[PDB]
Structures are given as C-alpha cells and as structure tokens.
Amino acid sequence: MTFKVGMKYMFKNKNSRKYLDISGNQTGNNANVQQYEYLADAPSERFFLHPLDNNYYAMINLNSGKVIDISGNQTSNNANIQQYEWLGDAPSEYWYFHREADGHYVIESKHSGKVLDIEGNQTGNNANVQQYEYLADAPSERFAVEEAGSVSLPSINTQPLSPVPQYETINDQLPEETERVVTAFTIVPAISVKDPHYGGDTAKQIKENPYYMVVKKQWWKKQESYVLAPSERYDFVTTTGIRVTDQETATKTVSWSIGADMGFSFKGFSMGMSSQYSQELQTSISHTTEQLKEETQEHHVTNPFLERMAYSRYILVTEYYVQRKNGTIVNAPWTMTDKTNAHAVTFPKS
Ligand SMILES: [Ca+2]
C-alpha cells in the first residue's frame, strides 16, 4: 500500500494478463483507458503512483501526464474509465488500493465506491476498462501492480535553522540577517505544478520534468535595534506578512497560498496534497479561507534595569520556491514574515 514516488508502475489484469493502457497513445482529456498486451517500452502502459490525502493515489500516465478518471463523474456500474488532467478537487481521480491474499489489488474509486474492471471479463487487446461494484470472485477486477523501473528524484541539502543572534556585550552589533538555510523540501509530481515552460502541455511536462522540488528556506531578519536609557520606553511599528504579488505567485505555481493563521491554504490542483505539503514542509494546514496580508503591529519595550539596555527584535522569514529537475526556478519565490515567530534579545539578558 506504500507505493514508491518516482517508480514507474504497470497494472496487469489477473483475468486477461493484459495491461492498463491509454487508447492510441492519446495525450488529451477523455482519452479511453483500455487493456493491451505487455510492450517492452511503450510509455502509454506506464504510470506513476502519487500518494494523496487519506491514503488514495493518483494514477499518472507517463505518456499523457494525465490521470485515471471516471467519464462524467458517474457512480454507476459499467461507467467508462478514461484519462483527464489532474484537477485536485475531482474525487473520480482518487484511487484506493486494496491488497488481496495472492498480492493482486482491487482499485476502488473514492467517488463511486466501485472498482476498476475489464468490461465483460474480456481477454483481448483494446478491451475497455470500466468500473463495477466490488465482487468477491471477479478476476477482471484484480490487477498486479508491477514495478517497471524507477526515475531519479531532485534533491537539496537541508540543515538546522540558525539560532537567533544574542548580545555578549551592550556594544555588540547584531547582524541584519542570519544565514539563509533550507529547513525542508518536498518532491511533487508535474500534476502539482503549473510551469509556464510547458503551459497545458502535460505530455511534454511529464517527459522532461516528471517531479519538481518545493524548497523552504528560512532565516532571522532584524526588525529593530535600539539602546534604551534607564527609565526609557521605546515604541515602534513593524510590517509583517506577505505581498499580494507573492500570494499570486504561490497560487498560480502550486495552487496554495498562506492563510491569515500562517497555515497552508489549499484549493484546485493542490487539493489531495494538503497532508504531504503540510507534513514535509513542516507548516500547519490553514483553518481559515482568509489570506495573510501585510499588517502593521505596534510594539513597546521598557528598560527594567538601572543601566542602559540594548534591544534587538528578530522575525522568522520563510521563502518557498519550486525547482525543476535542471535546477532552474518556476516563476519566482514567495516570501513571508511570521509575526507569531518573533524574538526580542537584550543586554543585559531578560
Ligand atoms: Ca475505458
């Protein structure tokens, strides 16, 4: 049930011993899913399996870059199985893999509760793939999931976040910024990225760039430095959050943005990937439709000492970007400051 990211898979029907295939090596929406005898190197018979929310999988064709789908979102017996572009919010594109005792799988629609099937128990080339109600004895509903060779995934080196700078003396000049370090990344399939180098060409995109890397880079930025006299109160203002421009870059690239609660706000072609994104980039799922904006905060500092007190304030900066196989960036990064992750450092220490 834990299939491998970047492993090419073929689906061998128990009854026919023939393979899930896209009719005519077609690239377009609504192209028929059929069975066809084993071919040594036809990409139309190979699929990536990408894990989705709630332990479903996307079945992504290596020729088309489109996914296994139910024609017209039908819930009935005999409804046709086709390919269609990954939408995210289409339950007919989500598949649950039930393992049987002999190692075959039954492949159940999230939408319909019916399973992949060969129409009429047919054994011939080009026999149609449909959905049918789950049946205890129906070898036409059983598929062997066979590894057909794995593809290298992009990678980047991660490390711990820099610590917040501290005063050793009242005279120390604390840095404007710490080193920028990658604290997390996640590998997402091409279905997850709208890349202007490919536009709507899903076939060319999956052939050249089947997997992208979403990178999270973080550092501390100094907002304020001041030395308070004894008895001094120092008041100041900060601007935090994210530019509308940067939210638009996130939305058009990976179809998520930053919620007002600092969580990931998922919609469209990022739906189904909320668990992977939140877990692997170590950021909560947003509990709000409200989007983070630039906001102004008011701050005060009072000096509790009978001597001068040095004061700096640091805020956590997070930059996200999407990296191609070839190391280039899709669109541009988006950058936020988190008002809920700010630290004051003083000398003497408080
Ligand atoms: Ca079909």
Side-chain angles (χ1 to χ4, degrees), residues 230-247:
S231 244
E232 199 176 345
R233 173 175 160 177
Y234 185 68
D235 289 28
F236 63 96
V237 154
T238 63
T239 302
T240 66
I242 185 168
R243 297 168 86 229
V244 168
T245 290
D246 280 14
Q247 293 276 49

Side-chain angles (χ1 to χ4, degrees), residues 31-34 80-82 128-130:
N32 195 39
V33 178
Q34 58 171 21
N80 189 45
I81 302 299
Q82 63 182 18
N128 187 46
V129 176
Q130 59 177 22

Side-chain angles (χ1 to χ4, degrees), residues 113-298:
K114 302 200 161 51
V115 309
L116 294 185
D117 182 44
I118 311 304
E119 186 195 38
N121 245 315
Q122 280 174 68
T123 61
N125 281 334
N126 308 115
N128 187 46
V129 176
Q130 59 177 22
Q131 71 181 4
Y132 211 81
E133 69 189 42
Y134 177 79
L135 288 175
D137 281 294
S140 228
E141 295 187 338
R142 275 76 187 163
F143 296 84
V145 175
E146 304 180 329
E147 290 180 358
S150 76
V151 145
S152 290
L153 296 183
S155 193
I156 194 159
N157 283 1
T158 63
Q159 70 182 81
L161 190 66
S162 324
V164 181
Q166 292 287 327
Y167 293 98
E168 300 165 355
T169 85
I170 203 152
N171 292 135
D172 286 17
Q173 195 183 76
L174 302 190
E176 294 301 306
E177 287 172 18
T178 63
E179 188 194 0
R180 312 188 179 189
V181 305
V182 179
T183 61
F185 72 91
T186 192
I187 306 306
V188 297
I191 52 163
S192 296
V193 179
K194 181 74 191 170
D195 182 348
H197 285 179
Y198 300 99
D201 200 339
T202 61
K204 178 147 113 287
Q205 183 181 32
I206 198 165
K207 294 171 192 177
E208 291 192 6
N209 205 294
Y211 290 97
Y212 292 85
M213 184 168 49
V214 187
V215 177
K216 181 185 183 186
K217 181 163 48 126
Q218 290 185 120
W219 65 101
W220 299 105
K221 178 158 77 177
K222 197 159 76 174
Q223 294 178 305
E224 253 318 307
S225 274
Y226 193 76
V227 177
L228 285 82
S231 244
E232 199 176 345
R233 173 175 160 177
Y234 185 68
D235 289 28
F236 63 96
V237 154
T238 63
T239 302
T240 66
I242 185 168
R243 297 168 86 229
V244 168
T245 290
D246 280 14
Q247 293 276 49
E248 287 173 344
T249 299
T251 295
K252 81 173 167 187
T253 311
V254 291
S255 192
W256 55 255
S257 57
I258 315 296
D261 62 2
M262 309 300 163
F264 290 153
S265 175
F266 299 100
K267 59 143 154 200
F269 56 88
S270 75
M271 294 297 43
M273 307 195 275
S274 67
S275 181
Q276 172 183 344
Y277 273 127
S278 56
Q279 287 294 303
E280 291 190 15
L281 296 184
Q282 305 186 305
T283 302
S284 299
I285 303 173
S286 183
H287 289 162
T288 187
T289 34
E290 187 178 319
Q291 308 297 106
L292 191 62
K293 347 279 279 157
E294 300 205 88
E295 15 187 0
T296 292
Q297 285 85 33
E298 303 176 4

